[PDB]
């Protein structure tokens, strides 16, 4: 827990960014942020330009369980300090409504960003795609070593900062744009390892599987939904085929930009056995070294 609340009186409402069962996320401008610049709030103020933040707000009539989960997220976010994980800027928890505040990325989520680019034969290069993926692996290494499981890794849950910096986040199913990526609890089945779908087992190994699918998205420049040839019920059936291990399971195809070795990395992320999936330390090393060294 942060020692002092961010002053709610400085948050100027701009836009509603999303909603869920227990609250909303708003885009706010911080009024006169130079007044707040301190050790507690080391805000990056650009004179002449508004300071924008995302604010997650718990409904004041939230249940006890909803409130506890919100405070659990506060506690988790207060620990996360890595260049490739979204940073908590402040909280409002002394009074209702409870709030968490992070930076707002004008470049949007990584899906939005890659969707707006084309592959260099605006453009983005294959080496930059590897850098994006390496950053995600590095953030995931950090999370896993702190004994967190993400459970919803995908390009839609990564934010694009300045100079191609990628921040892993977790927004939940709070945005209409990605409703088709979730199956009705509400689950991102196309990113989920077979054991998640069949047994509800979520682990770092299943985060690795999701990382494989996220890497696939990146190399596809977010042009195709994973398993777009399959209905939701068929995706669940595909998980059964991984369980069966009789060679009928469908794997995502190799993207045109993806060399065979990188594709085989992805296939290893989709190993039937968790213990055969590469750790994030290895995924990062492969992307930052092996793949980048073989352009
Ligand atoms: C305002 C806020 C409050 C909380 C969070 N929280 C997280 O992003 C997050 C990240 C990692 C974890 C780790 N956790 C481990 C356990 N498992 C099960 C889940 C994940 C938890 C929360 C983000 C935000 N930021 C946010 N939220 C929604 C939209 C945007 C946003 C949208 C567009 C551009 N810029 C920002 N930004």
Numbering used by the authors: 600 to 720, 736 to 798, 803 to 913
Sentences from the paper on this structure:
The DDR1–imatinib complex structure was solved subsequently using data collected from crystals improved by microseeding procedures. The structure was solved by molecular replacement and refined to 1.7 Å resolution. Disordered regions in the imatinib co-structure were identified in both the KID region and a portion of the activation segment spanning residues 799–803. DDR1 was monomeric in the imatinib complex, consistent with its size-exclusion profile, whereas the ponatinib complex formed a crystallographic dimer with an additional ponatinib molecule bound at the dimer interface. In total, imatinib forms six hydrogen bonds in the ATP pocket of DDR1. Two target the hinge region, including one between the pyridine head group and the backbone amide of Met704 and one between the aminopyrimidine and the gatekeeper residue Thr701. Two more are made by the linker: the amide binds to Glu672 in the αC, while the carbonyl contacts the backbone amide of Asp784 in the DFG motif. Finally, the methylpiperazine group occupies a hydrophobic pocket between the αC and HRD (His-Arg-Asp) motif and hydrogen bonds with the backbone carbonyls of Val763 and His764. The DFG motif further stabilizes the binding with a π–π stacking interaction between Phe785 and the aminopyrimidine group. The strong binding of DDR1 to imatinib was revealed by isothermal titration calorimetry (ITC), which indicated a dissociation constant (KD) of 1.9 nM.
